């Protein structure tokens, strides 16, 4: 070792290390397209994707940004006059783990 | 001396033809085959990958396995005289 | 690297290369694994981890395609590539819509009336078998390049002209530099469709303005 450099630290010592190449990338993309298309026929008039709530992101760094979440809460669904079994039949997603702690967050999802 | 003159005494034969594998490697006194471990139930551990591929499925005839694949392709139709038994089942 | 090999070491009046362990065959004692040996391993074996593709900035790709399009309307460049245009009245060519052609028979008659006869003939007469080992690896015949037809809207004319040797087709919205500058020399001859020619204003915009179709790009 000679001259001035940032001191090395390259982790190639382990002889059992595996390599992963990506030559399949264009082909696997084409398969995902063809699966969605055929799935879309099986339920023709209905959208392929369900409706999802809007939630607020996590840390101090992302407070001011809104995002999609997993599912509506039993309270949101009831406030809008629906019942859980009906909501499912009409393509609304449900999440019984989530809790409501604000007035604002509830009003928007309604 | 240990060279040429000792070669003259070498007239006994410790291995014979094995009935499981053919390989002239059954040691008569030990009661064991050095190629395939007969009479143990399982076959012996082969020393390396190169040597074991020389005795794998597909190195011989595969008589039964080939017929099974053709019958599966055809939908397992069976003997045509006995169709009624098949259909009931 | 398949074989069982080991060096004999010094003292035997032989070079200290690894040698093949065997008996009963002429293969006994021959020289095994090294790159200087018959049937040995090559130096630095070729390997799948090599970097096959290459990156180019999006801003350069956009600019290169714009100035390739420009060169298709300078006679000096078009002649320079080797397209022959002695009989053609004016450049660029713009075919109308309301072309109701469906058969190759009538399709060729149209192209002849635009003056392209000598160019098309130049392509048909060109077919030859390639020199070298490429003729064994599915690259047997070579032809000269001819006109490219550019359309934007779906029409029957596309499948009327396509069997004529040296005619090539692409949509304006996804026009590639491999088609616009073959071999890296610019000025390919282009037949425009009337819709496609008007679309160039939406695609590349106007001088010292920003294109609506190509976000973040200006000429």
């Amino acid at each position: 070792m000679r001259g001035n450099q940032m001191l090395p630290n390259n982790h190639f010592n382990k002889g059992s290390m595996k390599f992963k190449n990506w030559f399949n990338q264009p082909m696997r993309a084409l398969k995902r397209k063809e699966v969605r298309e055929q799935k879309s026929k099986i339920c023709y008039p209905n959208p392929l994707k369900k409706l999802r709530p809007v939630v607020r992101c996590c840390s101090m760094r992302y407070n001011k940004k809104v995002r999609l979440g997993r599912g509506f809460t039993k309270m949101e669904i009831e406030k809008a006059g629906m019942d859980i079994k009906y909501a499912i039949s009409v393509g609304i997603a449900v999440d019984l783990r989530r809790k409501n702690k604000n007035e604002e967050g509830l009003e928007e999802n309604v | 001396s240990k060279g040429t003159p000792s070669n003259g005494k070498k007239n006994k034969r410790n291995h014979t033809t094995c009935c499981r594998c053919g390989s002239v490697s059954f040691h008569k006194q030990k009661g064991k085959c050095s190629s395939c471990a007969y009479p143990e139930k399982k076959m012996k551990k082969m020393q390396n990958r190169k040597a074991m591929l020389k005795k794998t499925t597909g190195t011989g005839k595969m008589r039964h396995m080939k017929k099974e694949r053709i019958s599966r392709r055809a939908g397992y139709p069976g003997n045509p005289i006995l169709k009624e038994i098949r259909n009931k089942i | 690297m398949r074989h069982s090999a080991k060096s004999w070491g010094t003292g035997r009046a032989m070079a200290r290369v690894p040698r093949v362990r065997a008996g009963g065959t002429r293969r006994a004692g021959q020289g095994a694994n090294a790159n200087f040996c018959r049937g040995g391993r090559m130096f630095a074996p070729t390997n799948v981890n090599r970097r096959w593709n290459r990156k180019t900035l999006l801003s350069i790709r956009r600019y290169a395609s714009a100035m390739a399009v420009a060169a298709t309307s300078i006679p000096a460049y078009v002649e320079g590539r080797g397209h022959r245009i002695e009989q053609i009245e004016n450049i660029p060519l713009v075919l109308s819509n309301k072309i109701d052609t469906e058969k190759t028979k009538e399709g060729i008659k149209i192209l002849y009336n635009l003056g392209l006869k000598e160019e098309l003939d130049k392509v048909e007469e060109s077919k030859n078998i390639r020199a070298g080992k490429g003729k064994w690896r599915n690259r047997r015949y070579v032809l000269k390049k001819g006109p490219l037809f550019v359309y934007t809207s779906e029409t029957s004319f596309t499948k009327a002209i396509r069997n004529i040797p040296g005619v090539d087709t692409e949509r304006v919205e996804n026009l590639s530099i491999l088609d616009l500058a073959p071999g890296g020399q610019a000025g390919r001859l282009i037949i425009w469709m009337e819709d496609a020619f008007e679309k160039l204003t939406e695609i590349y915009g106007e001088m010292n303005e920003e294109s609506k179709f190509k976000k973040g790009y200006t000429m």
Partner: protein
């Protein structure tokens, strides 16, 4: 480096939301009461049938001599947790009374 620029005072600020009160679940139905009664009852019968274990006897003996701090140390070493020890002492005391 885009780290460690604010002071701890300004990191502690917060946006003024409007809260929702928690829904209390205090009502306990008739059937739930009988369920709990039967479980507590069953726990009596076991103690009546089989009695106390060796360390429970030794513990209760120390409580009669007012050896409070000895009993505390003893129970800590048997059960591991100082919380479990404090609870078991209180249950044993109530049994003797």
């Amino acid at each position: 480096m885009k780290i460690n620029k604010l002071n701890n005072a300004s990191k502690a600020l917060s946006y003024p939301v409007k809260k929702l009160a928690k829904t209390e679940k205090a009502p306990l139905t008739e059937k739930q009461q009988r369920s709990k009664e039967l479980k507590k009852f069953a726990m009596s019968i076991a103690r009546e049938v089989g009695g106390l274990a060796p360390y429970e006897l030794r513990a209760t003996e120390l409580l009669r001599r007012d050896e409070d701090k000895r009993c505390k140390k003893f129970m800590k070493k048997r059960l591991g947790s100082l919380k479990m020890a404090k609870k078991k002492i209180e249950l044993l005391a109530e049994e003797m009374r």
